[PDB]
Design a protein around this ligand. Structure first.
Ligand code: CLA
Ligand code: CLA
Ligand code: CLA
Ligand code: CLA
Ligand code: CLA
Ligand SMILES: CC1=C(/C=C/C(C)=C\C=CC(/C)=C/C=C/C=C(C)/C=C/C=C(C)/C=C/C2=C(C)CCCC2(C)C)C(C)(C)CCC1
Lengths: 181, 124
């Protein structure tokens, strides 16, 4: 979490100085005709998509959460609309397990894709992931998915907030002389 | 000069007011009236001109704005400097600022586009 918080810091520092670059160093007269100047001639469409994502991942992540709490409070945890991240379960299938049997990656040691480069280091791979005592690709399920859904929600919202502040830095409709300060 | 009497202290006997420039207003006051200071309660306005002390410029202009709405009286405000320099900063033209005057001039005026271009081609 130490390096995690400092990672978020460096991200914000990069984007803040990017906004300063657009204010004190950008010039539409020189960078014209490329793709960078073409961005902020139509950037409103990009801001629209990002706002839509921020609303979508909210009404469903937190909406699922409210359903979970309300139906568990009523004494029916089974009526709860549970969720299974089969995409994140596929990561566990990639670990070389040969007992799955539903045409997933690394489910059979005879497949040429699995046979390719399984001569030396794969024996340790399969032995290291087929354990409940290590932290090499843990089990993933509902309480594991819905938080990743929430992380996507918060991170996409954060992305929009960090980008639009640098986009509407020279001016906006509320204030087009923002560059004059 | 006969000035309205006010009680409550607060305004007077401030060191900062003594070391800082002070404002002095006046008004005709053809009739005995009762008004309110911008920083005090109520006080009776005596006949003839009345000189007061003010510590802020906005305080010196809001009182003139309030007097103009009551009755129709010309206002005079004089702004003194720290040592003893007394200059007429209010109505240097003696013509009301919103109304048109003959003595015209331009100070700090850039005549360029509206999005920006903050460079000034000429200060005077
Ligand atoms: C919850 C997130 C998180 C976590 C788990 C940690 C964890 C840790 N940080 Mg850290 N840190 C964080 C967020 C976090 N940090 C953030 C957001 C900042 C930016 C302000 C910092 C800035 C920071 C500095 C500058 C240092 C650490 C250090 C450390 C390590 C020493 C333990 C400690 O309590 O620090 C220290 C707590 C104090 C010093 C409290 C005293 C208040 C000071 C004197 C003022 C430790 C493993 C130290 C380190 O890296 O080891 C050398 C170190 O010097 N952190
Ligand atoms: C509109 C601009 C935009 C921007 C700036 C981002 C930015 C980002 N998206 Mg995203 N995405 C977008 C639109 C956008 N997305 C749209 C329109 C969709 C379809 C609804 C998605 C669906 C999507 C998914 C499914 C995922 C991301 C993820 C990510 C993050 C991972 C980036 C990477 O390369 O790895 C990143 C910060 C990943 C993530 O986990 O976010 C943290 C991820 O898995 N995005
Ligand atoms: C209790 C069930 C429930 C409820 C109350 C809602 C309610 C809502 N849904 Mg949702 N939805 C549901 C189930 C539900 N949904 C399920 C089971 C799915 C499939 C997983 C979806 C898939 C879905 C999608 C794809 C979208 C919604 C959207 C919306 C919002 C439309 C209004 C809007 O965005 O403004 C105006 C409408 C538009 C701008 C278009 C709204 C608040 C929209 C949304 O989330 O906003 C981004 C939308 O994009 N829903
Ligand atoms: C728990 C407090 C709280 C809550 C509930 C929200 C909720 C919301 N914020 Mg928000 N925000 C907060 C605190 C909070 N914020 C704080 C402290 C700040 C910093 C001051 C911000 C700054 C901020 C910004 C800059 C933006 C949002 C936006 C949004 C909306 C889109 C996110 C979403 O998930 O879609 C909706 C999910 C729902 C569950 C809808 C709620 C329906 C109710 C429950 C009925 C959403 C309704 C974004 C927005 O305006 O949306 C376009 C946006 O850009 N917030
Ligand atoms: C986007 C959020 C979302 C979605 C997709 C769903 C979806 C669903 N809910 Mg749910 N619910 C939600 C939010 C949501 N809910 C919230 C926020 C609450 C808190 C008030 C509840 C409380 C709730 C209850 C108490 C029940 C449902 C039930 C149901 C199921 C049938 C709904 C119904 O009325 O019968 C068909 C029309 C359905 C799959 C019902 C169920 O039995 O689940 C199977 C049911 O009993 N929901
Ligand atoms: C705003 C601003 C700025 C900044 C920006 C930025 C910083 C951005 C970013 C971003 C980011 C931060 C990104 C990231 C990324 C990544 C990517 C984009 C990738 C990719 C791809 C792929 C496809 C992959 C694949 C793979 C491989 C390779 C192997 C393994 C597996 C996988 C799948 C992963 C500037 C200053 C400029 C300007 C102004 C302001």
């Amino acid at each position: 979490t130490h390096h995690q918080y400092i990672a978020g810091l460096l991200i914000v520092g990069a984007f803040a100085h990017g906004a300063i670059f657009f204010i004190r160093d950008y010039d539409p007269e020189q960078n014209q005709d490329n793709v960078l100047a073409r961005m902020l001639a139509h950037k409103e469409a990009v801001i629209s998509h990002l706002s839509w994502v921020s609303l979508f991942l909210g009404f469903h992540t937190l909406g699922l959460y409210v359903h979970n709490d309300v139906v568990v409070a009523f004494g029916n945890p089974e009526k709860q609309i549970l969720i299974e991240p089969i995409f994140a379960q596929w990561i566990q299938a990639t670990s070389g397990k040969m007992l799955y049997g539903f045409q997933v990656l690394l489910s059979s040691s005879t497949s040429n894709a699995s046979v390719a480069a399984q001569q030396l280091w794969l024996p340790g791979w399969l032995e290291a992931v087929n354990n409940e005592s290590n932290s090499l690709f843990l089990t993933i399920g509902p309480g594991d998915f819905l938080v990743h859904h929430a992380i996507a929600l918060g991170l996409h919202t954060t992305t929009l907030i960090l980008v639009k502040g640098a986009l509407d830095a020279r001016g906006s409709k509320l204030m087009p002389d923002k560059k004059d300060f | 000069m006969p000035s309205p009497s006010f009680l409550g202290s607060t305004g007077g006997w401030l060191r900062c007011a003594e070391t800082e420039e002070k404002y002095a207003m006046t008004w005709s006051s053809d009739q005995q009236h009762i008004f309110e200071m911008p920083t005090g309660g109520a006080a009776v306005m005596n006949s003839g001109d009345n000189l007061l002390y003010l510590a802020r410029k906005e305080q010196a202009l809001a009182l003139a704005t309030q007097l103009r709405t009551q009755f129709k009286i010309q206002d005079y405000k004089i702004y003194r400097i720290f040592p003893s320099g007394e200059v007429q900063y209010l109505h240097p033209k003696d013509g009301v600022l919103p109304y048109q005057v003959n003595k015209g001039r331009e100070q700090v005026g850039r005549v360029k586009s509206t999005i920006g271009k903050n460079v000034n081609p000429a200060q005077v």
